[PDB]
RNA sequence: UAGUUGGUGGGGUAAAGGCCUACCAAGGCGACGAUCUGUAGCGGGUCUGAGAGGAUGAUCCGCCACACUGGGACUGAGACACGGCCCAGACUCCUACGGGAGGCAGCAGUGGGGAAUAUUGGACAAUGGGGGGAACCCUGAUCCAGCCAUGCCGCGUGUGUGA
RNA sequence: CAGAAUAAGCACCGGCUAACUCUGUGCCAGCAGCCGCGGUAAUACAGAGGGUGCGAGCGUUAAUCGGAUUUACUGGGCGUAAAGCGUGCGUAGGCGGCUUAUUAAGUCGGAUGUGAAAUCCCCGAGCUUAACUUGGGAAUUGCAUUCGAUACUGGUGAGCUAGAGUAUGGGAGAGGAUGGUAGAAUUCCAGGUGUAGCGGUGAAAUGCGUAGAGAUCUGGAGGAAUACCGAUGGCGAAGGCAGCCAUCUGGCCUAAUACUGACGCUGAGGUACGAAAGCAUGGGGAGCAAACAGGAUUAGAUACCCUGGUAGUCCAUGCCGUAAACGAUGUCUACUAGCCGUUGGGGCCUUUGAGGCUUUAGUGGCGCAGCUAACGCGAUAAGUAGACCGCCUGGGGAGUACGGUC
RNA sequence: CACGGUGUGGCCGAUGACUGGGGUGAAGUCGUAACAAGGUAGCCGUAGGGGAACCUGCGGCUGGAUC
């Protein structure tokens, strides 16, 4: 580009889209937990992975990895979700946080506690 | 059409010192003859004659080699006529450290910027010797 | 764009001025973005970056604007006035049904919303502010205290020996 | 004063990245920032031991800048990776030849005023240290006024001819528009000679023919296109332009004087032209041939092959505005080894007529330097520089939807 | 003159029976269009036709092999 025709027209910047949309600029969000489910991963891994579909208090209806083994989720639930995604699985870009409201931190875990939301064993 | 006779001037110098000639040659002007009598003066050329047929002017530059180089390594044009560019006497920008020229203008005629420096004032940066 | 742009006579203001008014003229703005539209309090500053730049405008200081939502004026040196008045609107409260009352974006606090942010505390002793000749009175400004690992900085949870 | 008495957790150990083994499970359960782990010996899943990093904290999520030269002013690109508008003309604008006088707007220098305090930085001071508080500086890169300088840019006056243009002689060309005309060939029609085939394919068949084909000879009708010359030739802004002749008409090349005296380059908007197909109205229609019909081939044929055949291809008057509209390379200017072809001109030399040297404007093949990721480009640059414009910012969604113009 | 009302016309948002294309996942069905001369060279513009990749006509390009 010349001298005049940046004069004429400057240089152009490009907006960065979020990739947590349902969040709203907010380290996590409250919801309802709509439908929970197993679901497969994408090639090349195989399993049964648990995913739950939640309403959030933004007005948005997105999908909620569970971590960990063993959850004692159900429909009516209320769940705090923050960001993060799966990657094998299409379409699931948050997470459920373990032990914050209606979750249950795992069961018999002594390791990554703070993960997972497990208190210390006596 | 040509519209930067200082940069045609320069251009003629920097392809004849790669392509290995004696001398080279122009059309004239009083601007050109006073940067070749700067860089006759710093070195970097040898020798500077003006010649007049009738109303024509020609400029004849005699180039040096040393060793097997030129002694012109890199002679750029900086203030064009698309971007002039002016500096003060504390901006005035030096060339490989010192080991270099910068040809500026000032209202007390064409220095280097060593004698820019020197008398306090600025001008219009026209080229960089090295 | 038609009080629109300029002029004259008059009005009006603490004061210049289409600020208003009656006539006269056809002007004024716009690709150097007018008009319309979206967003937004501005600055000193803060974060990042070698720099140039980019992002930002809590806490401190200056300026501006607002006070349930709109339209007004009064008093006064000063207001079109958070805890003043008049009018219109929505809402809320008391009632013996005759008649009345109100505006926490002041401090504390309640409900709600939210991932999330505190006590319905003490004193005018200090610095200021209002009134008074003074004595002195008032001051949720302020100075302090309470709660929270929210941040920064500092300290401890022991030291030596012991094969 | 009493007595160790009251006071350690969190993340991680496949690579990026400091820290490794054993059990349990077997593409399950699970992990995951990216690349990826798990399908019987998993240092990557869970536990344990050991270790590493931090420590009243340790991790996760969210957000800003950086790394990102990944919007490139500093500081990027457009032959093939994304990217030169299909091609011209031209408006606003940007930029612009040489000499001289003057001005002082840009530019540079000095002085003065201002640039609140706090904040940042420096030297100190007080907090048991530190955070923190605080004295004084430095800084606030800016703005305004005034006084100076005149090299460069701008303004004004004067002058010049190397850019640009004008008149006069000569030259080459499928440049454009209109109207005539010539020869070859295909088809059809008529007639003579003549008699069983012709045509078509890999092979066949559909088809034509005993109311006489095909073949051969004579005459006529009509439409479309111009063999040989013909060429890495020519002309045109591009798209494009071929028989011959006349009329009207554009540009280019070449020589020498003469003339004007910067009158130039580029160009957002705008506007003109713009292959083929297609559209509208009216003509024309030989050959060819989308659609379509039939015959073959094939597992199927919807196609390739064969026999037919309508739009269209042609003309007049308009529209459409798109192509791998390509050199996948915007226009203009200057400079930088050489060698060999070719087209249109100028000059010189032989010495008789045909050759040999140069120079200019095009058109080709190699190739030094230079450039490039490489391929390659290389005086017709993709080299060295300048002026202006257009365009690009991962792949799809998508040159799509909506709105608008035509 | 604020608030209000009437008529008509703009712009923005939400919602809507039904309907069209797009992406992703998994490779289930019919074919084999492209990549070698891909077995009819490929591609570009345009027009017509077809269950579908696609086929055919006209013009263009080499980013086409063998000669
Ligand atoms: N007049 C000023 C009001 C202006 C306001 N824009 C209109 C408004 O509020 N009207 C209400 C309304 O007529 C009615 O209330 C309901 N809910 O219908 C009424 C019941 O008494 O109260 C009036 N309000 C009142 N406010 C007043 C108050 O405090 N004192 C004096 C008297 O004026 C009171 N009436
Ligand atoms: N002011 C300046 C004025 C400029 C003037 N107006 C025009 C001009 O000067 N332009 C500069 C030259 C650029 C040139 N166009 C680029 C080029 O040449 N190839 C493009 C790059 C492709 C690749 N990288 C090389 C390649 O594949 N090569 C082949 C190859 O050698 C050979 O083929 C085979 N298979 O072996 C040959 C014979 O078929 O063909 C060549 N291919 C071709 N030869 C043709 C040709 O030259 N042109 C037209 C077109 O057809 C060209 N393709």
């Known amino acids: ?122 | 059409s040509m519209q930067d006779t200082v940069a045609d001037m320069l251009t003629r110098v920097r392809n004849a010192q790669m392509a290995k000639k004696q001398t080279v040659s122009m059309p004239s002007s009083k601007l050109k003859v006073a940067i070749a009598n700067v860089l006759q003066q710093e070195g970097y050329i040898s020798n500077v004659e003006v010649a007049q047929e009738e109303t024509k002017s020609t400029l004849t530059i005699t180039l040096k080699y040393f060793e097997g180089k030129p002694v012109i390594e890199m002679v750029k044009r900086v203030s064009r006529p698309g971007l002039r560019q002016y500096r003060g006497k504390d901006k005035l920008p030096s060339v490989k450290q010192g080991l270099g020229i910068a040809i500026v203008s000032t209202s007390k005629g064409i220095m280097t910027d060593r004698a820019a420096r020197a008398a306090g004032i600025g001008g219009e940066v026209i080229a960089f010797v090295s």
Do not use: W
Not at chain 1, 2 to 17: A, D, Y
């Open chain 1, 1 to 122: 580009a010349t001298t005049n025709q940046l004069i004429r027209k400057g240089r152009t910047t490009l907006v960065e889209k979020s990739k947590v949309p349902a969040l709203k600029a907010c380290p996590q969000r409250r919801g309802v937990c709509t439908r929970v489910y197993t679901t497969t991963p994408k090639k090349p891994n195989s399993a049964m992975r648990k995913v739950c579909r939640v309403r959030l208090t933004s007005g948005f209806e997105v999908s909620s990895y569970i971590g960990g083994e063993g959850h004692n989720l159900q429909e009516h639930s209320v769940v705090l979700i923050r960001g993060g995604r799966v990657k094998d699985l299409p379409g699931v870009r948050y997470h459920t946080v373990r032990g914050s409201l209606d979750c249950a931190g795992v069961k018999d875990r002594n390791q990554s506690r703070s993960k997972y939301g497990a208190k210390r064993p006596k």
